[PDB]
Amino acid sequence: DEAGITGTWYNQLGSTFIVTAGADGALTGTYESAVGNAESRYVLTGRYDSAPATDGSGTALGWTVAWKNNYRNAHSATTWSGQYVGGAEARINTQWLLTSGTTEANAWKSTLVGHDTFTKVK
Amino acid sequence: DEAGITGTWYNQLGSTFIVTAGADGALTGTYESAVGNAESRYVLTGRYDSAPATDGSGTALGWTVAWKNNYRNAHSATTWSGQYVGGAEARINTQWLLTSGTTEANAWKSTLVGHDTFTKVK
Amino acid sequence: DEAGITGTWYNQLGSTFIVTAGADGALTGTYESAVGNAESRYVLTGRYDSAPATDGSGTALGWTVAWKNNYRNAHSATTWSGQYVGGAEARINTQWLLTSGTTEANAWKSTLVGHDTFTKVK
Amino acid sequence: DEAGITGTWYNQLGSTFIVTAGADGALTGTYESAVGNAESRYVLTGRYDSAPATDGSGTALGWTVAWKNNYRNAHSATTWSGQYVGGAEARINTQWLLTSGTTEANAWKSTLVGHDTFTKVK
Structure with a gap:
């Protein structure tokens, strides 16, 4: 799944995820x-199961974006946790957590949760 | 917060997180x-807001572990999303998502959610 | 949205949700x-926004099932939190949390998270 | 656990949850x-495991609040999913999802996630 995961992916919102999967799980x-x-591109890094089970199971993975780049700083970070599913209609099915920096008093309202599905088309 | 985040952290379960925060957000x-x-140590990588707001707000960050190392392969990955809060009682307050690789039929039961609080003592 | 929500709904897994929405938000x-x-049917109860905003916004709602009925007791409960979106292709888009009773030592692994989309067909 | 759950509970934020647990799981x-x-009190309803396991396990439960009452309408609903743990230091440990009604375009940012711990004191 180094081969399967490396590449450009697109989610239901029209976001673009460009990833390289390394030998060692990066x-x-x-x-x-x-x-x-x-605005524009943000660094991501993450990890994946580089020796998944061979039984029709997905490949577990995750990654983070901090929403700071040269253009904007949104004082926030998202992590996506999910699985890669290969085949003609390959997919990365994820759930995500977006935490904003907050005061202590507002920490209860720090974190959004959602779900993104990535495909190799659209 | 490069200084504040770099180091060894411990959560409520007795887990140990050893991190280096780079200049550029790594x-x-x-x-x-x-x-x-x-068993034993697993690689992690993530990202943080390297220029947080200066208003008493936390610093957003996140990281991933894939649960594969030389000893075991749990076909799973956790992402933690949270914020660093500095000061004498510094803390990293997180919520996490642990996805296992599953068959398609079992994908509904792929993902655990929880919350970990990290401190610099215990 | 009493009218819109009351009825039979079906999710992506093929589960069936039969609900009555009361005047007062039940x-x-x-x-x-x-x-x-x-196996078979389980009681649910919940609440909805009975006076939603009139601006194209969804109607917030939620409900719980405890997984005990006359046939089985799964020592667990799911809550769905989401929004009803009306129109020709009405939908209830949810995220859910399924907690199992656990020992204290296993409480870290108590709770699954996922997402279900309900429609009036299938 | 009808006896254990019925009563007044307080969380870490200083919120108050007043509940009656019925024989049949309500x-x-x-x-x-x-x-x-x-502002002020909002109706809740939910469900619990009325015949939990007898092995030191918690009792699974959940409930919903829609944030509409005579004073305010926040176009939102929270569900708490968790477990009751009895004993001298009884607790209800929960995770929650707060969904707001949104436009379709903003549905990605509809849902907050967090965690509340309820005790019988404070």
Whole structure:
């Protein structure tokens, strides 16, 4: 799944995730959100199961973006946790957590949760 | 917060998170879980807001562990999303998502959610 | 949206949610899961925004099932939190949390998270 | 655990949850949030495992509040999913999802996640 995961992916929001999967389990790349307080590409890094089970199971992985780049700083970070599923209709199915920096008093309202599905087309 | 975040952290479960925060927003290190299908240290990587707001707000960050190392392969990955809060009682308050690789039929039961609080003591 | 929400709904897993929305914000009904340690119908109760905003916004709602009925007891409960979106292709888009009773030592692994989309067909 | 759960509970934010646990698995009561766009008491309803396991395990439960009452309408609903743990230091440990009604374009940012711990004191 180094081969399967490496490449450009697109989610339901029209965001673009460009990733390289290394031999040893690393994920590196860039993320460009179609939504939110984001412009242009942001660094991402993560990890994946480089020796998944061979039984029709997905490959577990995750990655982070901090929403700071040369253009904007949204004082926030998203992590996506999910699985890669190969085949003609390959997919990365994820759930995500977006934490903003907050005061202590507002920490209860720090974190959004959602779900993104990535495909190799659209 | 490069200074504040770099170091060894411990959560409520007795897990140990050893991290280096780079100038440019990178997080690198190792994680050792006190629980679950885990032994010894696992690579982690992540990202943080390297220019947080200066208003008493936390610093947003996140990181991933894939639960594969030389000892075990748990076909799973956790991402932690949270904020660093500095001061005499510094803390990293997180929520996490642990995805296992699953068959398609079992993908509904792929993902655990929880919350870990890291301190510099215990 | 009393009218819109009341009725039979079906999710992507093939589960069936039969609900009545009361004037005053109550949700009552039954749930039958196509997956998991479940058989036949389980009681549900919940709440919805009975005076939503009139601006194209969804209607917030939520409900709970405890997975005990006359046939089985799965020592667990799911809550769905989401929004109803009306129109020709009405939908209830949710995220859910399924907590199992656990020992204290296993409480870290108590809670699954996922997402279900309900429609009036299938 | 009808006996154990029925009563007044307080969380880390200073919110108050007043609940009655019925024989048959129902939860009914009121919730008053110390934070957010909330004033005074809101109806809640939910469900619990009325025949939990007898092995030191918690009792699974959940409940919903829609944030509409006679004073305010926050176009939102929270569900708490968790477990009751009895004994001298009884607790209800929960994770929650707060969904707001949103436009379709903003549905990605509809849902907050967090965690509340309820005790019988404070």
